[PDB]
Short mmCIF file of C-alpha atoms in Angstrom, two decimals:
data_model
loop_
_atom_site.label_atom_id
_atom_site.label_comp_id
_atom_site.label_asym_id
_atom_site.label_seq_id
_atom_site.Cartn_x
_atom_site.Cartn_y
_atom_site.Cartn_z
CA UNK A 4 -25.06 21.83 12.51
CA UNK A 5 -22.57 20.80 9.87
CA UNK A 6 -25.28 20.55 7.20
CA UNK A 7 -26.39 24.09 7.97
CA UNK A 8 -22.86 25.44 7.77
CA UNK A 9 -22.31 23.80 4.40
CA UNK A 10 -25.57 25.21 3.06
CA UNK A 11 -24.27 28.66 4.00
CA UNK A 12 -20.97 27.90 2.28
CA UNK A 13 -23.01 26.84 -0.75
CA UNK A 14 -24.66 30.26 -0.52
CA UNK A 15 -21.34 32.06 -1.15
CA UNK A 16 -21.81 34.05 -4.34
CA UNK A 17 -19.93 33.40 -7.58
CA UNK A 18 -18.66 36.87 -8.55
CA UNK A 19 -19.17 36.62 -12.29
CA UNK A 20 -18.41 40.35 -12.77
CA UNK A 21 -14.72 39.40 -12.24
CA UNK A 22 -14.60 36.21 -14.33
CA UNK A 23 -13.87 37.68 -17.74
CA UNK A 24 -10.57 36.07 -18.73
CA UNK A 25 -11.60 32.48 -18.06
CA UNK A 26 -14.87 33.00 -19.97
CA UNK A 27 -13.22 34.25 -23.17
CA UNK A 28 -14.16 31.63 -25.80
CA UNK A 29 -10.51 30.84 -26.51
CA UNK A 30 -9.83 30.18 -22.82
CA UNK A 31 -12.91 28.05 -22.20
CA UNK A 32 -11.21 25.04 -23.80
CA UNK A 33 -8.37 25.38 -21.27
CA UNK A 34 -10.73 24.68 -18.34
CA UNK A 35 -11.57 21.12 -17.34
CA UNK A 36 -14.80 22.14 -15.56
CA UNK A 37 -16.02 25.53 -16.75
CA UNK A 38 -17.79 26.57 -13.57
CA UNK A 39 -14.42 26.28 -11.72
CA UNK A 40 -12.22 29.05 -13.16
CA UNK A 41 -10.27 31.89 -11.57
CA UNK A 42 -11.37 35.30 -10.55
CA UNK A 43 -9.35 37.89 -12.44
CA UNK A 44 -8.18 39.56 -9.21
CA UNK A 45 -6.09 36.50 -8.23
CA UNK A 46 -5.66 34.46 -11.43
CA UNK A 47 -2.11 33.34 -12.19
CA UNK A 48 -0.90 35.47 -15.10
CA UNK A 49 1.57 33.92 -17.54
CA UNK A 50 3.87 35.85 -19.87
CA UNK A 51 2.89 36.45 -23.49
CA UNK A 52 4.84 36.57 -26.75
CA UNK A 53 4.18 39.40 -29.22
CA UNK A 54 2.60 37.01 -31.70
CA UNK A 55 0.52 34.35 -30.01
CA UNK A 56 -2.44 35.44 -27.98
CA UNK A 57 -4.60 34.47 -24.99
CA UNK A 58 -1.49 32.58 -23.81
CA UNK A 59 -1.32 34.63 -20.60
CA UNK A 60 -4.15 32.47 -19.20
CA UNK A 61 -4.19 29.32 -17.11
CA UNK A 62 -6.96 27.93 -14.89
CA UNK A 63 -5.07 28.72 -11.69
CA UNK A 64 -5.41 31.12 -8.76
CA UNK A 65 -3.21 32.54 -6.05
CA UNK A 66 -4.67 31.59 -2.65
CA UNK A 67 -3.65 33.07 0.69
CA UNK A 68 -1.97 31.01 3.38
CA UNK A 69 -2.09 31.63 7.11
CA UNK A 70 0.97 33.85 7.32
CA UNK A 71 1.47 34.82 3.68
CA UNK A 72 -0.44 36.27 0.76
CA UNK A 73 -0.35 34.21 -2.48
CA UNK A 74 1.00 31.21 -0.60
CA UNK A 75 -0.70 28.53 -2.72
CA UNK A 76 -1.46 28.14 -6.38
CA UNK A 77 -4.76 26.22 -6.67
CA UNK A 78 -5.13 24.79 -10.15
CA UNK A 79 -6.81 22.04 -12.12
CA UNK A 80 -5.14 18.86 -13.22
CA UNK A 81 -3.56 19.86 -16.54
CA UNK A 82 -5.06 18.82 -19.86
CA UNK A 83 -2.97 17.43 -22.71
CA UNK A 84 -3.23 20.80 -24.44
CA UNK A 85 -2.53 22.76 -21.23
CA UNK A 86 0.59 20.90 -20.06
CA UNK A 87 3.00 23.43 -21.57
CA UNK A 88 1.22 26.24 -19.69
CA UNK A 89 1.32 24.23 -16.47
CA UNK A 90 5.11 24.00 -16.56
CA UNK A 91 5.43 27.63 -17.72
CA UNK A 92 3.55 28.61 -14.57
CA UNK A 93 5.75 26.44 -12.33
CA UNK A 94 8.77 28.08 -13.88
CA UNK A 95 7.71 31.73 -14.10
CA UNK A 96 6.17 31.84 -10.65
CA UNK A 97 9.04 29.81 -9.11
CA UNK A 98 7.05 26.99 -7.60
CA UNK A 99 9.36 24.35 -6.11
CA UNK A 100 6.56 22.14 -4.68
CA UNK A 101 3.66 20.35 -6.34
CA UNK A 102 0.87 18.66 -4.37
CA UNK A 103 -1.19 16.26 -6.48
CA UNK A 104 -4.46 15.04 -4.97
CA UNK A 105 -5.82 12.77 -7.73
CA UNK A 106 -4.89 9.75 -9.77
CA UNK A 107 -4.48 10.14 -13.53
CA UNK A 108 -7.68 8.07 -13.83
CA UNK A 109 -10.37 7.33 -11.27
CA UNK A 110 -13.54 5.26 -11.78
CA UNK A 111 -12.55 4.46 -15.36
CA UNK A 112 -12.31 8.07 -16.54
CA UNK A 113 -9.60 10.64 -17.30
CA UNK A 114 -8.99 12.96 -14.33
CA UNK A 115 -5.53 14.47 -14.98
CA UNK A 116 -2.92 14.26 -17.71
CA UNK A 117 0.39 12.71 -16.63
CA UNK A 118 2.45 15.88 -16.88
CA UNK A 119 5.66 14.37 -15.44
CA UNK A 120 7.95 11.61 -16.81
CA UNK A 121 7.79 8.29 -15.00
CA UNK A 122 11.36 7.56 -16.16
CA UNK A 123 13.95 9.74 -17.86
CA UNK A 124 13.09 13.07 -19.50
CA UNK A 125 10.15 14.77 -21.22
CA UNK A 126 10.06 18.19 -22.89
CA UNK A 127 6.90 20.32 -22.73
CA UNK A 128 7.34 23.56 -24.63
CA UNK A 129 10.57 25.32 -23.73
CA UNK A 130 10.94 23.29 -20.50
CA UNK A 131 12.54 19.90 -19.87
CA UNK A 132 11.58 17.76 -16.89
CA UNK A 133 13.78 14.85 -15.75
CA UNK A 134 12.89 12.58 -12.83
CA UNK A 135 15.76 11.85 -10.44
CA UNK A 136 14.10 10.21 -7.42
CA UNK A 137 10.81 8.48 -6.74
CA UNK A 138 10.09 7.06 -3.29
CA UNK A 139 6.71 5.64 -2.33
CA UNK A 140 5.98 5.81 1.39
CA UNK A 141 2.56 5.21 2.94
CA UNK A 142 0.07 6.56 0.36
CA UNK A 143 2.45 9.38 -0.68
CA UNK A 144 4.80 9.38 -3.63
CA UNK A 145 7.58 11.96 -3.35
CA UNK A 146 9.16 12.69 -6.71
CA UNK A 147 12.12 14.97 -7.44
CA UNK A 148 12.48 16.50 -10.89
CA UNK A 149 15.27 18.41 -12.52
CA UNK A 150 13.52 21.26 -14.35
CA UNK A 151 15.36 23.21 -17.07
CA UNK A 152 14.28 26.30 -19.01
CA UNK A 153 15.92 25.76 -22.41
CA UNK A 154 15.52 29.34 -23.76
CA UNK A 155 17.43 31.42 -24.48
CA UNK A 156 20.52 29.30 -25.14
CA UNK A 157 22.47 32.11 -23.42
CA UNK A 158 21.35 31.98 -19.77
CA UNK A 159 20.48 28.28 -19.87
CA UNK A 160 23.08 26.98 -17.40
CA UNK A 161 21.53 29.17 -14.70
CA UNK A 162 18.02 27.93 -15.57
CA UNK A 163 17.88 24.75 -13.49
CA UNK A 164 15.74 23.96 -10.46
CA UNK A 165 14.63 20.96 -8.44
CA UNK A 166 10.84 20.71 -8.28
CA UNK A 167 9.44 18.22 -5.80
CA UNK A 168 6.07 16.57 -6.26
CA UNK A 169 3.98 15.02 -3.49
CA UNK A 170 1.48 12.57 -4.99
CA UNK A 171 -1.15 11.62 -2.43
CA UNK A 172 -2.75 8.19 -3.03
CA UNK A 173 -4.89 8.12 0.11
CA UNK A 174 -8.19 9.51 -1.15
CA UNK A 175 -10.54 6.71 -2.27
CA UNK A 176 -12.30 6.74 -5.62
CA UNK A 177 -15.66 7.18 -3.85
CA UNK A 178 -16.22 9.25 -0.72
CA UNK A 179 -13.54 10.43 1.72
CA UNK A 180 -10.66 8.74 3.57
CA UNK A 181 -11.62 6.57 6.52
CA UNK A 182 -8.89 8.23 8.64
CA UNK A 183 -7.39 11.70 8.94
CA UNK A 184 -3.82 10.49 9.44
CA UNK A 185 -2.83 10.37 5.77
CA UNK A 186 -3.87 13.98 5.21
CA UNK A 187 -2.00 15.17 8.30
CA UNK A 188 1.16 13.40 7.14
CA UNK A 189 0.80 14.98 3.71
CA UNK A 190 0.34 18.44 5.22
CA UNK A 191 3.27 17.96 7.62
CA UNK A 192 5.60 16.79 4.84
CA UNK A 193 4.69 19.64 2.47
CA UNK A 194 5.26 22.22 5.23
CA UNK A 195 8.60 20.67 6.17
CA UNK A 196 9.70 21.02 2.53
CA UNK A 197 8.72 24.72 2.44
CA UNK A 198 11.42 25.51 5.02
CA UNK A 199 14.25 24.27 2.80
CA UNK A 200 12.79 26.08 -0.22
CA UNK A 201 11.56 29.22 1.49
CA UNK A 202 8.51 31.27 0.60
CA UNK A 203 7.89 30.14 -2.96
CA UNK A 204 4.25 29.30 -3.74
CA UNK A 205 3.01 25.73 -3.43
CA UNK A 206 1.15 24.35 -6.45
CA UNK A 207 -1.88 22.26 -5.42
CA UNK A 208 -4.13 20.49 -7.89
CA UNK A 209 -6.80 17.80 -8.01
CA UNK A 210 -8.75 17.24 -11.23
CA UNK A 211 -11.04 20.26 -11.64
CA UNK A 212 -9.16 22.33 -9.07
CA UNK A 213 -11.64 22.91 -6.23
CA UNK A 214 -12.69 19.95 -4.10
CA UNK A 215 -9.76 18.05 -2.70
CA UNK A 216 -7.57 21.04 -3.52
CA UNK A 217 -9.61 23.32 -1.28
CA UNK A 218 -9.67 20.64 1.39
CA UNK A 219 -5.86 20.55 1.49
CA UNK A 220 -5.44 24.31 1.43
CA UNK A 221 -8.14 24.77 4.09
CA UNK A 222 -6.53 22.18 6.36
CA UNK A 223 -3.05 23.66 5.96
CA UNK A 224 -4.44 27.09 6.81
CA UNK A 225 -6.49 25.75 9.74
CA UNK A 226 -3.75 23.62 11.31
CA UNK A 227 -1.15 26.38 11.00
CA UNK A 228 -3.54 28.80 12.73
CA UNK A 229 -4.08 26.29 15.54
CA UNK A 230 -0.34 25.88 16.07
CA UNK A 231 0.28 29.62 16.07
CA UNK A 232 -2.74 31.02 17.96
CA UNK A 233 -4.82 28.11 19.25
CA UNK A 234 -7.89 29.50 17.43
CA UNK A 235 -10.17 27.27 15.33
CA UNK A 236 -12.87 28.32 12.81
CA UNK A 237 -13.39 25.75 10.02
CA UNK A 238 -16.35 27.67 8.58
CA UNK A 239 -14.43 30.93 8.15
CA UNK A 240 -11.38 29.17 6.73
CA UNK A 241 -13.44 27.48 4.02
CA UNK A 242 -15.65 30.49 3.25
CA UNK A 243 -12.52 32.57 2.80
CA UNK A 244 -11.39 30.06 0.17
CA UNK A 245 -14.74 30.30 -1.64
CA UNK A 246 -14.19 34.04 -1.79
CA UNK A 247 -10.92 33.37 -3.62
CA UNK A 248 -11.96 30.65 -6.11
CA UNK A 249 -15.37 29.10 -6.92
CA UNK A 250 -16.52 25.91 -5.19
CA UNK A 251 -13.39 25.37 -3.03
CA UNK A 252 -14.29 22.35 -0.86
CA UNK A 253 -17.01 21.17 -3.21
CA UNK A 254 -19.18 18.55 -1.47
CA UNK A 255 -20.69 18.14 1.96
CA UNK A 256 -18.53 15.04 2.47
CA UNK A 257 -15.32 16.99 1.88
CA UNK A 258 -16.50 19.52 4.44
CA UNK A 259 -17.11 16.63 6.88
CA UNK A 260 -13.59 15.40 6.17
CA UNK A 261 -12.23 18.83 7.08
CA UNK A 262 -13.74 18.43 10.56
CA UNK A 263 -12.60 14.81 10.86
CA UNK A 264 -8.98 15.74 10.18
CA UNK A 265 -9.14 18.62 12.66
CA UNK A 266 -10.44 16.36 15.43
CA UNK A 267 -7.80 13.73 14.56
CA UNK A 268 -5.13 16.45 14.85
CA UNK A 269 -6.28 17.56 18.30
CA UNK A 270 -6.50 13.91 19.37
CA UNK A 271 -2.86 13.45 18.42
CA UNK A 272 -1.67 16.81 19.80
CA UNK A 273 -3.34 17.32 23.20
CA UNK A 274 -1.55 20.58 23.95
CA UNK A 275 -4.01 22.29 21.55
CA UNK A 276 -7.23 20.89 23.06
CA UNK A 277 -10.13 22.82 24.63
CA UNK A 278 -9.20 26.49 24.12
#
């Protein structure tokens, strides 16, 4: 049953007619995994100076939430030479929340560049990031950063924001979590934070930007639909993500984990059972 659904998800077409920007030779080096790049219709567009060129491109897509269009930004873990773009996207598109679903290294290999300072300040491009708080609590690090856009010198005192990063440590190096609880806590805590910040897009990334990232987005969409309408359709939620960005929810085991977390949620919250 579940194998047959995932085969049909696998059958969702890559719409290469709309993949021109990420396939430009200059932009291919900005992708970590080249088959996982945005469609042009929902790619996150950065600003561009008069001189330098192809700098309007980042491997990132707007992804719809349950209530809201463009609710998430699904992106890859930044590369050393894409870290300035990463923060330019956070700034220009006013993200106040980052959800990180990978370690910097897993199974002895580089999965994501450490784009945030562990202590003190770091400056990437025109943007300075300073960590102010860092609390570990049950497989989730919550980090608060003071983010400052340093240009022009004129408006600079207005150009300060607090960006909060949720770093999930609960996904093992091999396979999928044994329990759904850690993912539900992560989802709950990110949604709580969106109230205080309002409807600014949430930045979600793993390493290549599809597997765990799509799992998180799919589960947030699914659980919010259950709470609002009591209706459940895992297949449609995931397929709809594949229509927005290639390979969202990448492996059969991640699709299994989607169902596990959903069952765990209804086991905790009985008022939603058996509709």
